[PDB]
Amino acid sequence: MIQRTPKIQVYSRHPAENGKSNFLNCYVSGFHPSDIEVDLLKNGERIEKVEHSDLSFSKDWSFYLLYYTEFTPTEKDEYACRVNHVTLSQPKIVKWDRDM
Amino acid sequence: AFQGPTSFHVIQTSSFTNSTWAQTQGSGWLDDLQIHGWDSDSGTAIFLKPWSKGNFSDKEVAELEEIFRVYIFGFAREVQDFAGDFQMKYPFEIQGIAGCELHSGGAIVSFLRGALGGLDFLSVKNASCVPSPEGGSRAQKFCALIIQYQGIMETVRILLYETCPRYLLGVLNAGKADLQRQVKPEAWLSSGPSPGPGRLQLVCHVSGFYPKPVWVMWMRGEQEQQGTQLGDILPNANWTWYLRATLDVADGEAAGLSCRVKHSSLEGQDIILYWGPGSG
Numbered sequence: 347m348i349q350r351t352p353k354i355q356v357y358s359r360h361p362a363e364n365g366k367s368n369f370l371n372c373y374v375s376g377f378h379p380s381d382i383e384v385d386l387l388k389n390g391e392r393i394e395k396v397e398h399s400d401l402s403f404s405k406d407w408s409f410y411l412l413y414y415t416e417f418t419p420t421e422k423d424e425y426a427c428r429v430n431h432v433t434l435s436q437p438k439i440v441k442w443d444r445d446m
Numbered sequence: 447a448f449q450g451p452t453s454f455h456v457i458q459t460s461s462f463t464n465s466t467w468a469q470t471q472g473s474g475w476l477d478d479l480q481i482h483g484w485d486s487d488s489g490t491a492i493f494l495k496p497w498s499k500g501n502f503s504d505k506e507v508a509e510l511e512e513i514f515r516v517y518i519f520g521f522a523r524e525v526q527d528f529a530g531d532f533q534m535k536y537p538f539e540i541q542g543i544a545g546c547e548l549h550s551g552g553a554i555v556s557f558l559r560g561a562l563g564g565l566d567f568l569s570v571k572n573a574s575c576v577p578s579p580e581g582g583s584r585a586q587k588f589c590a591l592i593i594q595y596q597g598i599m600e601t602v603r604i605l606l607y608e609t610c611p612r613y614l615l616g617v618l619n620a621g622k623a624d625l626q627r628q629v630k631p632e633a634w635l636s637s638g639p640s641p642g643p644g645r646l647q648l649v650c651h652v653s654g655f656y657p658k659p660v661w662v663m664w665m666r667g668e669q670e671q672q673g674t675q676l677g678d679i680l681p682n683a684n685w686t687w688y689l690r691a692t693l694d695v696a697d698g699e700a701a702g703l704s705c706r707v708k709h710s711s712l713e714g715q716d717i718i719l720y721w722g723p724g725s726g
């Protein structure tokens with residue numbers, strides 16, 4: 347059996363202009379097994395109604411998902427993606443970064 | 447070639463928590479573009495586009511359904527039986543991908559490739575179960591113990607060969623509508639995470655573009671730097687993709703650089719963003 351760590355990338359659908367509604371995206375990929383936990387936070391709180399792709403994998407058999415929710419950024423407002431997988435020691439949190 | 451998908455295939459992730467607890471997740475694709483969803487606990491389907499069905503009839507469509515629907519129910523019902531037999535340790539997960547694809551002129555090759563343990567397990571070639579060495583005792587054990595079901599094999603061939611391109615070319619056309627459409631880009635430079643304090647992280651985004659193929663380089667006049675780290679084409683929930691592309695350089699040398707951005711949807715009218723000053 348194999349166990350692949352999930353890879354996490356976060357990003358906005360359009361270059362954010364504070365005060366202007368964007369799309370926060372969180373793309374987990376390359377993990378395995380497919381049981382995973384994903385959330386998208388706002389200042390550390392799990393944002394509510396979020397949509398996400400349907401399970402799907404790649405040639406090497408690793409799965410990936412696209413989590414994303416509409417949001418309106420500011421100078422303040424810290425946003426991050428919290429991933430939890432059998433292969434992780436403790437929930438992994440990657441924060442968004444307008445610059446990154 | 448003609449711009450868009452070149453294959454359609456289904457996908458199956460059946461996860462086995464234990465002898466009586468199995469959960470299977472299926473879906474239908476065209477490269478990355480998912481056009482078919484399978485609502486599970488019911489047994490139906492989810493067409494995500496008018497052209498999801500493909501020049502196929504509400505009569506044949508609804509026909510495939512039961513095949514799939516029952517296959518799933520059966521596939522699980524079975525695995526749990528031979529679970530001890532093939533000495534499976536719970537929990538395990540088995541994946542499956544199968545479909546056909548077009549190729550450089552007019553020869554349509556299909557495929558059905560299964561996995562277990564996140565590993566290769568079996569491949570169908572010239573209509574016949576082929577035990578990926580990756581499997582072992584069990585792969586042969588199954589590949590063989592399964593050939594002895596001509597009906598199953600019967601269905602497998604038809605769909606896989608007969609029913610597939612008849613459908614493939616079918617939807618591709620049925621939906622050449624927006625499958626060949628063209629969405630131009632976006633773009634916006636930005637600098638962040640400094641390498642060796644005194645150097646700079648030139649970051650050139652590019653979003654919303656469709657089709658997927660795309661060009662992006664941190665050039666300086668006629669020429670490029672190529673030290674340019676082309677990122678991964680991640681995706682947007684809308685059928686378009688995102689794409690970072692960093693550049694590594696020193697304080698001064700930054701200024702005077704730009705991000706060129708070709709694309710099938712721009713027509714020589716590339717995107718150029720020069721590396722301005724101060725205001726990020």
Ligand SMILES: CCCCCCCCCCCCCCCCCC/C=C\CCCCCCCC/C=C\CCCCCCCCCCCCCCCCCCC[C@@H](O)[C@@H](CCCCCCCC)C(=O)OC[C@@H]1O[C@@H](O)[C@H](O)[C@@H](O)[C@@H]1O
Pocket residue numbers: 455456457458472473474482483484491507510511513514516517519520521524525528532540541542543544545558559560561562567568588592598601602605606609610613
């Ligand atoms: C008795 C069998 C014993 C088996 C022992 C197994 C021991 C387990 C050890 C571990 C082995 C790992 C093996 C991994 C194999 C992976 C195969 C994956 C293949 C394909 C992916 C399928 C994706 C499914 C979800 C798709 C969702 C699509 C949505 C919409 C469709 C919209 C229209 C477009 C149509 C386009 C079609 C494109 C081509 C696709 C072709 C894919 C192949 C489909 C195969 C369908 C065969 C139907 C078979 C069933 O009749 C049968 C299955 C039995 C299990 C074995 C399957 C092996 C496959 C190689 C079945 O169970 O019949 C049950 C009977 O039902 C009743 O009549 C009655 O109660 C009884 O007679 C039976 O219950």
